[PDB]
């Protein structure tokens, strides 16, 4: 019941919005997990790992360069926008909205959202493998050697870029190999980020889970914590629940969410 949800929405002083891959798929943004989610011969799971990067950094950078480049044509959707404008409007009223996103596409930022926790990192940040410095980076192409590389066809030839010509750290003293500042399979989420997220979740009085499920990860880490405080949770996702069924709005979030958050 949308009206019952909106009664909670009217009263909420601190909303936490958790977003998963569904919100990015609706912007035309490939996830690379699922039957369609091939890039050349590989799926995301094969490439987004430190072992792939150690043994073929050029291949992994071709993949991330492709993804960075494809974001130029993909735009925020009505769900991203509703979330951004909601935060702005409620902020003026002294009410807090925070976004906790699994997504690395920066679309929430492009939509206008300010209070955003990117728990998996970002496609458009680098981390230096040598000195550890994290830097925002939106250059197209990120380095000259990658220019025009990353084609997704299976029989596209590998660039095989010497490591010295991949993106490097710009402190002319370090010069270390950069990696995407993204959490890979086999890596831990940042402790400091999780502590901040725990604070926000503990203080919130309404939580929305958008383009993923409360029962799946990462929502499963944190939504239980909020539910056990007695706080209402509202899912917006395309997933069904059975017939013998907190709140669930089935469908594309770019349809459901702007109406819900009016």
């Amino acid at each position: 019941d949308l009206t019952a949800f909106r009664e909670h929405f009217a009263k909420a002083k601190h909303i936490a919005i958790i977003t998963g891959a569904g919100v990015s798929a609706e912007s035309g943004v490939p996830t690379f997990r699922g039957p369609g989610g091939f890039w050349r011969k590989w799926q995301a799971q094969d490439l987004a790992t430190p072992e792939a990067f150690s043994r073929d950094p050029s291949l992994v950078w071709e993949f991330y360069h492709y993804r960075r480049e494809v974001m130029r044509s993909k735009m925020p959707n009505p769900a991203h926008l509703a979330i951004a404008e909601c935060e702005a409007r409620l902020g003026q009223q002294g009410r807090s909205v925070v976004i906790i996103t699994q997504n690395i596409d920066e679309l929430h930022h492009r939509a206008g959202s300010k209070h955003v926790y990117e728990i998996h990192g970002s496609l458009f940040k680098t981390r230096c493998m040598s000195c550890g410095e994290v830097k925002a980076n939106h250059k197209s192409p990120i380095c000259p050697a990658l220019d025009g590389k990353g084609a997704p066809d299976p029989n596209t030839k590998e660039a095989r870029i010497p490591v010295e010509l991949l993106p490097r750290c710009e402190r002319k003293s370090c010069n270390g190999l950069l990696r995407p500042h993204v959490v890979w399979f086999g890596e831990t989420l940042d402790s400091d980020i999780l502590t901040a997220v725990e604070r926000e979740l503990e203080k919130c009085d309404l939580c929305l889970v958008v383009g993923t499920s409360s029962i799946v990860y990462p929502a499963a880490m944190f939504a239980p914590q909020v539910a056990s405080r007695g706080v209402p949770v509202a899912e917006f996702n395309m997933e069904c629940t059975p017939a013998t069924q907190k709140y669930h709005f089935e469908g594309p979030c770019g349809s459901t969410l702007p109406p819900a958050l009016e």
């Binding site: 998996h120 399979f185 890596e187 831990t188 989420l189 402790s191 999780l194 990860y217 990462p218 880490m221």
Partner: peptide
């Protein structure tokens, strides 16, 4: 530290 996707 939390393994991405519980290591699944």
């Amino acid at each position: 530290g939390v393994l991405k996707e519980y290591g699944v």
